Symmetry: D3
Subunit: 216 residues, 6 copies
């Protein structure tokens, strides 16, 4: 049945889930929610996610939160619909290693950059130079390892596109709209790899759904 | 003519300007803009605001940025339309002092709190306890001074509602939707003063325009 | 064949892997390695782990790094040996959600505490009060959610002990040796749940292997 | 009557007020005060400034604090004496925008630099490299915008020297005595603009009053 | 001959040296110096102290910097004049241990507190709550150890007042003028010990020389 | 009798003491201790060191802690055995100044670097770029002063090797095993000076005792 994805359509963490839902060609609606923005604070969304973070997904009777837990659950549960995000042809050792690398090395460095360079200015604040510098450099070192790996593998886990690559898509997308898009562009294989991901029909759909504002 | 307010309708810094535009009963439209979110980064909004921050207001041939510069400009320029946000009956010494107090004591402590407790969770992140603690405490000390002052003055600058009070409205509003709403509630005069501001017809209009999401 | 676990036997991240290897009853040896501690710096371990972090595991021809990637790989690969860390009887939705909760909520708060209160003093430094306070409080909120969950489930994913619980063991162990052991003790179900984990024979073995120093 | 300016004559925030008092040619004395430096802490200056910060100015029966609130009050109150810091010939849109730019972009970056490079060493401490780097870079970006603006305007608000320029003087002065004086020097119009400000007779007087120590 | 002490008479690090010079009853003058405050930056005091920090002391042909290096040098060099700050009757093990404790535990926590609560407000800034909290708590734990020690020893190194105690005096003095003076007062022996130090004639002289401002 | 040095043989702060014990040719054993790593936390090592930090040294009936207090005590107490770490031929002014420089300028910058680049990766963590950058740069400026000094002096205090040089050895050793070893290598005299220290027989012994792991 139509899956319910709770969250703001602009949040890259919501887009990471939408990414996987389109690949699998599953039906779903993105439901925006008032976390606490209603005042007199008496815990409501806390019923879906007790940690009170977006996104959350309701799968019939199942409720899941943690975008990566959701992506993995959906990828194995609906293993047949759409793309096989967990190919048995992909290396299992590489697939598990790169899922964690994204979680612990790419994400923690990619998000602060998207936050300082995209979100803050939209809210009336100037990017924190110290935060940008620390993370741009850390992400650069991280992307040097992706570069050497991708020079030897078409995708993260091997010849085929898997969950490992899809989990990167929303943040690569947002990174490309910042002045730090060069971290990706300057690395040949990272760049090719990224351009291959954007070319994906499912991804095209996902991007199409982001309520991105119009120029000045 | 209809003023153009560039920015996201959810940003409290945009709401601070809308606050003053409704009091003056001026006509305007809030135009959302793509700051850099279009990639291949080649500076567009930078033409309105070279600092690249929201909001910006176009008044015919005039372009202004810095929400407080905009509010003051509009308050003196359209001095007659709607409320007199700069009454000659208000104390000039108090009016100037409390405009700066808001800028240097209230704002710097109120925004981090709104950011960590409202924005971050909407983006998939958990509030930073250290940031919340530092600022809740600093805002508390700041609000103890407002409390003693407001026990002796109906409004910040005196008997009447002025620009000094209006500049606080959007952030008091957002603060009320967080678990730190108590900083205001626990202080009798701050609370009365705030409740008086919400009662204002102009403010009612402003609140009405915020595209606040629906509950879970 | 005997798996090679590269790392210091005292590092909780190495112990998290050993935890899973004993449950599965697999054979392995923990090999301590010189990361860069040999000077004239010309990258050696970087061949196992290009990120240059411990631990790394060599499974015949396979090399994996990221303790959780290693644990998951071993848990599905050697699915039959020893305990079934991935029971098909466990809820799949809960199992995936709690694997991520540990990674994103428990770990990031548990490690700084172990680092400031255990490691630093061993190296001649005093714990940073600000770091301890921030994380003890964040971990406390996190453990309030575990408490409510564990009041309703024997283990994280349900009736049985799974990978989700095992991934917590080394850090719960180290936390218990700090002045913040109370975060666990003060929560009834968290405490029972933890005491159940220590009772496990496999865990007993693991603890037995940590080269913990003798009292003064 | 002779205005009383409470504060240390070396504090740039006190000098920012003195700057405006000399332009207006008003009479005043700078009174140094014991904030809390008398021990057994029982709040005294707190009567002038409840926030307990310097400077404070007593204008007969009026007490004001917040250096910029003081400068604006004096600039409009004594609108005729000395220089017209608020010319009706100056652009009102530019004047309000640049008053805020100084407050939110220049000041927050200029002060940390003066603090780490001038104050700390005088107190036995070494400058924090991270703080200097973050702010020198942020101030640099800020001064690139001043440069483009000043290439098109003689002064911030237009053809004439206004309050907007005067509010910058004390910090430009202190910045020039640091190793980061180059941020100003390297920008042609910023440099010319600054040199024009120092040439002002009123400013000459102000500088003359700072109790600056003698060389080694 | 009259020793030359370079530095501001208000800086507690200069007062720590003056403390020891008066005990020894040596003659000296405190010379205030322009560190870099002369602009066009071309290194002058750097000749006394290449680190460019205050204080520096010129002893005839000798130049020393690092307040504690100066205090120790003077204490052994002029071992006979005035008080024997290095009594052979004092425990040598205790004397060396408490000289380092002051340097590594007391000083690093006492100075941030004096800086945020005394210096910043004098310069127009509000104390950083996070910095005050972190250090007040760390100093509290440190003073609990002094309390237990001082319950068993009249002074740090034993029965007599030594260099170890004198090195604490200026910072205990400044701490007493802050809202955190209670850290000392609340600990019986620390308090008695401190009151004994203030009673010292030499110390009375030292305090007398600090150019402390008059009340409001 | 055989001195007991409490601590981990890998900790550079323990190695700083061992350094001085070998120079003096004293007998001792390095005893590793459980600080709190035994749980149910009821203070044991706290009897040697109430601050609960390593190392501690028991000299018969004497207990000392603070590595530098220990080094100085042993250097004067066993003044005759082995090397005279406190030569009366060395300049007393230079000797005291450089003991403090190491404590306040070298150590605080050298340790964070050893911690982020050596310790963290051994524990499963990535170096913090911001911390490395801040300290590498601060240490660089510090080493520029050592360079100019060492171009004029064979050793820190003069012609002979003293306690001042020995206190640097363990950290210079660890720094050499990091990617920041260049800070030393790139400075001619610092490099020569360091190479002279490693050549020392006593130092050779010390290095020999560090339980450094074998390559991958």
């Amino acid at each position: 049945a139509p899956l319910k994805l709770y969250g703001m359509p602009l949040s890259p963490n919501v887009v990471r889930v939408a990414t996987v839902l389109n690949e699998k060609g599953l039906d779903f609606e993105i439901v925006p929610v008032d976390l606490t923005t209603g005042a007199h604070k008496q815990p409501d969304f806390l019923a879906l996610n007790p940690f009170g973070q977006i996104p959350a997904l309701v799968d019939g009777d199942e409720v899941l939160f943690e975008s990566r837990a959701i992506n993995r659950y959906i990828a194995s549960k609906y293993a047949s619909e759409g793309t096989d995000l967990l190919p048995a042809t992909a290396s299992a050792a590489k697939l598990e290693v790169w899922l964690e690398v994204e979680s612990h090395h790419f994400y923690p460095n990619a998000s602060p950059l998207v936050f300082q360079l995209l979100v803050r200015p939209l809210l009336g604040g100037a990017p924190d130079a110290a935060v940008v510098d620390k993370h741009a450099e850390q992400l650069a070192k991280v992307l040097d390892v992706y570069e050497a790996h991708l020079a030897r593998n078409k995708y993260l886990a091997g010849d085929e596109f898997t969950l490992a690559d899809a989990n990167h898509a929303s943040y690569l997308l947002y990174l490309s709209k910042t002045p730090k898009a060069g971290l990706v562009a300057a690395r040949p294989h990272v760049k090719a790899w990224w351009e291959a991901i954007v070319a994906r029909p499912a991804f095209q759909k996902t991007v199409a759904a982001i309520p991105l504002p119009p120029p000045p």
